[PDB]
């Protein structure tokens, strides 16, 4: 077969994908399943918060219709504010049953609010608030169901009266998780909206002392050549999906705040994971300048946050595939090689597989929704910038990056 040009891989890569998130997901909710091999009953909240950036990419890539896509959005939207569907000061749990709404424990304390999935919820939902802007009964009732949402959910509530934010609140465990968000991690969206909040706003000093004082905070040392400026140090910045999931909606390009230049930090990250597998200390089959990526997701030996301190022999394709806008050459270069080489072994029904480990001859089996959403949506805002214009035109998200002191080219 002829070889695809870019445009063309990219696309087809886009349009399998986003199968995962339309054909796939739940018919009474449009939730996203957390797994195609798990419960035929599990949605998972952040996933689908990824799945609704994932509708507005493929209304304007042309694989969904404008009206399909709105009628879609208004089914999930009225699900997620239903008062049958469970919710706790605003948030809601990491899964619940995507027919009835009724949260699903995703561990034994772990029953009730998860802010962090709910950030990502909240980020692809004031993407489409910015987007779906038509004077019709579907999108006008679209965008009022999204600011009332919006506007009840308690961030501030999470602090505890204290200068950090926690990850969960249960009504049967209370604070027992006790789990403190320590930057530089996946969650820096949480702070961000929290700052942002009309209703329910942190202070400053919750982002400042709460997030920004950590062990895995200020990093600045150097790897392969390279100053990372932030992040894990033993993990090099930790999985790379820490460059993803709050950066969907949140354009790190020109994004500084006292603490660093986020560009840089999104740059730093992706080639210093690629410089690791490049390296290959281990000696792993494969891994190599078409073969790179390390972050969390199924593995031959079961499910791992894999990086360069927890390399298990998994190559996992969201990690190069979602860092394209950050180094778009390289990431381009593995997901050619993932579909032309691997693709008999890797490329299925949902796109590519979760990962693979080419030295003991594993393909995962599975598709997760929280490593299919990201290959779609930064395909997209590599290609166009789609998802971090709608995000960043937010008027109380441009406040809150304000109240924290950001600089940004869409500031001002």
Same mark, same amino acid.
């Given at each position: 077969?002829? *070889?695809?040009? &870019?445009? !063309?891989?990219?696309?087809?890569? #886009? $349009? *399998?994908?986003?199968?995962?998130?339309?054909?796939?997901?739940? @018919?009474?909710?449009?939730?996203?399943?957390?797994?195609?091999?798990?419960?035929?009953?599990?949605?998972?909240?952040?996933?689908?918060?990824?799945?609704?950036?994932?509708?507005?990419?493929?209304? !304007?890539?042309?694989?969904?219709?404008?009206?399909?896509?709105?009628?879609?959005?208004?089914?999930?939207?009225?699900?997620?504010?239903?008062?049958?569907?469970?919710?706790?000061?605003?948030?809601?749990?990491?899964?619940?049953?995507?027919?009835?709404? $009724?949260?699903?424990?995703?561990?034994?304390?772990?029953?009730?609010?998860?802010?962090?999935?709910?950030?990502?919820?909240?980020?692809?939902?004031?993407?489409?608030?910015?987007?779906?802007?038509?004077?019709?009964?579907?999108?006008?009732?679209?965008?009022?169901?999204?600011?009332?949402?919006?506007? #009840?959910?308690?961030?501030?509530?999470?602090?505890?009266?204290? &200068?950090?934010?926690?990850?969960?609140?249960?009504?049967?465990?209370?604070?027992?998780?006790?789990? *403190?968000?320590?930057?530089?991690? !996946?969650?820096?969206?949480?702070?961000?909206?929290?700052?942002?909040?009309?209703?329910?706003?942190?202070?400053?000093?919750?982002?400042?002392?709460?997030?920004? /004082?950590?062990?895995?905070?200020?990093?600045?040392?150097?790897?392969?050549?390279?100053?990372?400026?932030?992040?894990?140090?033993?993990?090099?910045?930790?999985?790379?999906?820490? %460059?993803?999931?709050?950066?969907?909606?949140? &354009?790190?390009?020109?994004?500084?705040?006292?603490?660093?230049?986020?560009?840089? #930090?999104?740059?730093?990250?992706?080639?210093?994971?690629?410089?690791?597998?490049?390296?290959? @200390? $281990?000696?792993?089959?494969?891994?190599?300048? $078409?073969?790179?990526?390390?972050?969390?997701?199924?593995?031959?030996?079961?499910?791992?946050?894999?990086?360069?301190?927890?390399?298990?022999?998994?190559?996992?394709? %969201?990690?190069?595939?979602?860092?394209?806008?950050?180094?778009?050459?390289?990431?381009? !270069?593995?997901?050619?090689?993932?579909?032309?080489?691997?693709?008999?072994?890797?490329?299925?029904?949902?796109?590519?597989?979760?990962?693979?480990?080419?030295?003991?001859?594993?393909?995962? @089996?599975?598709?997760?929704?929280?490593? *299919?959403? @990201?290959?779609?949506?930064?395909?997209?805002?590599?290609?166009?910038?789609?998802?971090?214009?709608?995000?960043?035109?937010?008027?109380?998200?441009?406040?809150?990056?304000?109240?924290?002191?950001?600089?940004?080219?869409?500031? /001002?």
């Amino acid at each position: 077969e002829k *070889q695809l040009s &870019d445009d !063309e891989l990219m696309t087809l890569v #886009q $349009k *399998q994908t986003f199968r995962y998130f339309w054909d796939f997901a739940h @018919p009474e909710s449009g939730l996203a399943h957390e797994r195609s091999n798990g419960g035929a009953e599990t949605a998972t909240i952040g996933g689908s918060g990824f799945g609704v950036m994932a509708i507005i990419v493929g209304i !304007e890539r042309g694989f969904v219709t404008r009206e399909q896509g709105a009628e879609r959005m208004l089914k999930i939207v009225r699900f997620l504010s239903d008062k049958n569907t469970d919710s706790y000061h605003g948030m809601w749990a990491h899964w619940m049953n995507g027919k009835t709404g $009724k949260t699903i424990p995703f561990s034994r304390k772990d029953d009730g609010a998860d802010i962090v999935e709910s950030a990502f919820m909240f980020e692809g939902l004031l993407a489409a608030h910015q987007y779906f802007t038509k004077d019709n009964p579907t999108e006008n009732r679209i965008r009022g169901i999204i600011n009332n949402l919006w506007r #009840q959910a308690e961030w501030n509530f999470f602090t505890q009266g204290q &200068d950090v934010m926690y990850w969960h609140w249960s009504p049967n465990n209370g604070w027992a998780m006790n789990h *403190q968000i320590k930057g530089h991690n !996946e969650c820096h969206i949480v702070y961000i909206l929290g700052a942002s909040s009309p209703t329910y706003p942190i202070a400053e000093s919750v982002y400042h002392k709460g997030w920004a /004082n950590a062990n895995t905070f200020l990093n600045g040392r150097e790897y392969y050549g390279i100053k990372l400026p932030l992040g894990n140090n033993h993990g090099k910045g930790g999985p790379l999906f820490f %460059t993803h999931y709050s950066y969907m909606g949140l &354009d790190p390009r020109g994004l500084k705040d006292r603490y660093a230049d986020y560009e840089e #930090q999104m740059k730093a990250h992706t080639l210093i994971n690629r410089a690791y597998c490049i390296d290959n @200390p $281990k000696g792993y089959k494969g891994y190599g300048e $078409k073969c790179w990526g390390l972050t969390a997701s199924d593995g031959d030996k079961g499910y791992s946050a894999h990086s360069p301190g927890n390399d298990r022999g998994v190559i996992t394709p %969201t990690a190069a595939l979602s860092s394209i806008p950050y180094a778009p050459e390289y990431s381009l !270069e593995a997901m050619r090689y993932f579909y032309e080489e691997l693709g008999d072994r890797l490329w299925g029904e949902y796109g590519f597989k979760d990962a693979f480990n080419l030295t003991e001859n594993w393909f995962a @089996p599975s598709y997760l929704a929280i490593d *299919q959403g @990201p290959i779609i949506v930064m395909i997209e805002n590599y290609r166009t910038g789609l998802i971090w214009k709608l995000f960043m035109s937010h008027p109380d998200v441009q406040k809150g990056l304000r109240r924290l002191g950001f600089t940004s080219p869409y500031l /001002n």
